[PDB]
Amino acid sequence: QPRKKRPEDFKFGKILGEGSFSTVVLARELATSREYAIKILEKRHIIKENKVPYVTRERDVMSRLDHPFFVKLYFTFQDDEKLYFGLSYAKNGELLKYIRKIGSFDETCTRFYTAEIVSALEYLHGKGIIHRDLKPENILLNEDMHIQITDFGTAKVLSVGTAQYVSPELLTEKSACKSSDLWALGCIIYQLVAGLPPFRAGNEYLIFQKIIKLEYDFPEKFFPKARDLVEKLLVLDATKRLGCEEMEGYGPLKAHPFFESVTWENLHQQTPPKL
Ligand SMILES: Nc1nc(-c2ccc3c(N)[nH]nc3c2)cc(N2CCO[C@H](C(=O)Nc3ccccc3)C2)n1
């Protein structure tokens, strides 16, 4: 392996993202002219706020992963005050931005991007890893417009996330499983099509109320096969969500009529439909 990298090895530029206890900064490595998204954390702050387990979890998970649809951790280093994680730079930023930009996806784009997310989760879950906070904000887009999923501090490795995407089991048990990610997937599909998350309200409490009641509905202009699929994912009983182990996994999920024209084997090699 190459020698440990250091801050002076890079020219730092603009801020790419702000976390609860971290900041992601675009950086160019001088020797290679390569661009990385460097996540910077203050050791003192992480210790003071008892965040060490989240930092460690993200490092350990983002290292075990080797798949095109996930942001990769290339290297780490530190100076007296800070930790630096060198991550893949996804030039086109957050999926959330594109949803806001174009309003709502047509069926061809919904299907392609939904398929990449499903394919990514199949990989992740096959490694016994659960994301636990999947959302448009951490589904990034590469220069090529393929997804790259990031933000793994909340992940769990098998032996409360963002309000709008929280699964019922978190609200009623404080427990999460692979199926929690599938619930998130259902919300994300709904949002790609409707342009809005399914569970919306004045505040967090009211959102949680709707979730545990499964109180939401489809606009008239919702692709019917997408609706059927969403209905098989947004299910209160976590053991009855399409894709989960008790439902026999990813086979039946990928075989859903909404994905009829999808070629699953090489999505990363296909050219994404123009947004
Ligand atoms: N790994 C990671 N990558 C990015 C990122 C952003 C832009 C990028 C680009 N343009 N290319 N690559 C990029 C990578 C951002 C990010 N988050 C920022 C938002 O907050 C999160 C947080 O605090 N999560 C949390 C909070 C508390 C506990 C556990 C987890 C952390 N995490």
Side-chain angles (χ1 to χ4, degrees), residues 253-264 266-267:
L253 176 49
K254 287 150 86 170
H256 190 277
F258 181 65
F259 298 124
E260 214 156 340
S261 61
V262 173
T263 300
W264 289 100
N266 62 341
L267 285 168

Side-chain angles (χ1 to χ4, degrees), residues 14-26 36-39 41 51 53-55 57-58 62 71-72 85 87-94 131 133 135 137-138 140-142 148-155:
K14 67 175 183 168
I15 285 171
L16 298 169
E18 315 266 23
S20 310
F21 43 92
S22 66
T23 302
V24 187
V25 186
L26 178 57
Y36 292 98
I38 297 186
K39 190 157 173 187
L41 308 95
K51 298 312 185 187
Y54 298 105
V55 175
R57 177 53 54 82
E58 175 162 71
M62 298 192 79
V71 169
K72 172 161 178 279
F85 292 177
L87 310 178
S88 310
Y89 172 41
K91 189 178 178 179
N92 283 308
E94 312 177 355
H131 191 292
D133 195 21
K135 53 185 174 178
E137 190 182 3
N138 55 29
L140 308 190
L141 295 156
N142 192 255
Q148 281 187 109
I149 296 172
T150 197
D151 184 14
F152 284 86
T154 64

Side-chain angles (χ1 to χ4, degrees), residues 100-116:
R100 277 171 187 166
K101 184 176 181 174
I102 82 167
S104 69
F105 284 26
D106 69 12
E107 188 165 5
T108 295
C109 298
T110 301
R111 159 177 312 113
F112 181 85
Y113 285 107
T114 297
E116 292 205 332

